[PDB]
Structure 1
């Protein structure tokens, strides 16, 4: 009973720590690379991320200066 719920929570805590460590280690090794070439890394990541998001979400590509639209939700 007692031990049961004790170890149960303890696992979540351990998972967080382990997950945190991994993410930290990834951002660690990558930080010096960014400092070496900030502009090049920024452009690469920026385009890589942008192509992924726009790859799925629909787009209009309509010209500005006209303020009218119909969201048409459901």
Structure 2
């Protein structure tokens, strides 16, 4: 006696642990989902107001970001030569 009566607590605590743990992910998932859902539900009405302008600004803005970090070449076309030079 008293051997099995102590095994259960160990698992019991761990069981409630995962429950709350997974419930947090689901709670955060729902929350984050709603936030992202609301994020696009606010840009879509304004996007429809001026699709070309919003697309152009986002595109030009997105471009200066990627280009700002990544290197550039701007080499003329019709030439099949480059050095990947990886590591």
| Superimposed CA distance per residue, residues 29-54 of structure 1 (whole angstroms, 9 cap, x where no aligned partner) | 11111111111111100001101010
Count of matched residue pairs: 74
How far is 1:4 from its partner?
A: 1.6
Per the normalisation by structure 2, the TM-score is: 0.81
Deviates further, 19-28 or 2-11 = 2-11
Provide structure 2 residue ranges, at least 5 long, that are not aligned to the other structure.
Answer: 1-13
Higher helix share: 2
| Superimposed CA distance per residue, residues 14-73 of structure 1 (whole angstroms, 9 cap, x where no aligned partner) | 111110100100100111111111111111000011010100000111110010111111
Over the residues paired in the alignment, what is the CA RMSD in angstroms? 0.8
The equivalent of 1:40 in structure 2 is 53
Report which of the two structures shows the higher radius of gyration computed on alpha carbons: 2
